[PDB]
């Protein structure tokens, strides 16, 4: 839910 979650390749931003 709070895990696995796309949000974590975000992270990554446009950088």
Do not use: A, D, F
Request: hydrophobic share 20%; no cysteine.
């Amino acid at each position: 839910k709070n895990v696995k979650s796309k949000i974590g390749s975000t992270e990554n931003l446009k950088h």
